[PDB]
Amino acid sequence: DPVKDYLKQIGKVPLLNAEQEVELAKRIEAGLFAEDKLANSDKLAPKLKRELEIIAEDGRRAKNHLLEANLRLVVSLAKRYTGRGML
DNA sequence: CAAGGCACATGACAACGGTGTTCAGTGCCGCGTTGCCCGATACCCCCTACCCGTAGTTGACTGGCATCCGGGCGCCGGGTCGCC
C-alpha cells in the first residue's frame, strides 16, 4: 500500500537529458558560488545579496529537479538489492 | 646446848640450738603475646596484529510487488449511495 502511494508521489516529473542536465549543473555551480560569496563576512550590497540568495534558491530547485528525476533509477537499484533482510 | 661457820642446789638469770618462718628478691623453668627475615603478587611501563569506522570506485544500466479466494456467523455500527 504505502509503496504505491510513494510511486504516485513520484508521479510524472520531467526526465533529464544532456543539455537540460548540464544547464542545471551550470546553475548549480552558479548558485554555489553565489552562496559562497554570501557567506563571506565582507560587506556586500543588499540587492546583490538578494540576487545571490535567489540564484542559490534556484540552484536548490535544480537540485530537487535532479533528485525527483532520478528517484526512478534509485528505486530500480533498490529492487536490484532488496530481499536480503532489509525492507 | 645454842649460835656461827662452810657444802650443793636453787629461784631467778640469758644466750645458744635448731628449726621452721617473714620478707623479698630474684630467678628456674614451665605456659603465653609479638619481633624478625623474606617471597610472592598487584601495578606502572613499551609496542603491534588485528578490529572497526570512513572514503571512494566515471560506457551506460530510470517503476516493485503485488494476489488470488471452499470459514461462517453474526452482529453492530457507521458510511456511502440511493430515493425524492
Q: Which nucleotide is nearest to A71 (CA to C1')?
A: B62
Experimental method of this PDB entry:
cryo-EM
The 8-class DSSP code of residue A40 comes to: S
- Please answer whether residues A44 and A38 qualify as being in contact, where contact means their C-beta atoms are separated by less than 8 angstroms: yes
Q: Are A30 and A59 in contact (CB under 8 A)?
A: yes
Secondary structure of residue A45 in the 3-state scheme: coil
CB under 7 Å from strand B: A 3-4, 7, 10-12, 15-16, 69-73, 75-76, 79
With cell 504505502, the residue in question is A2
Q: Are A69 and A14 in contact (CB under 8 A)?
A: yes
Which letter does DSSP use for residue A28 in this model? H
Q: How distant is C1' of B17 from CA of A43, in Å?
A: 140
CB distance A35 to A52 below 8 Å: yes
SS3 state of residue A42: coil
Resolution in A: 3.7
Angle at A61 between CA A56 and CA A65, to 5 degrees: 140
Q: Are A51 and A37 in contact (CB under 8 A)?
A: no
- Beta-carbon count within 10 A of A52 CB: 21
Distance (Å, whole) CA A51 – CA A82: 44
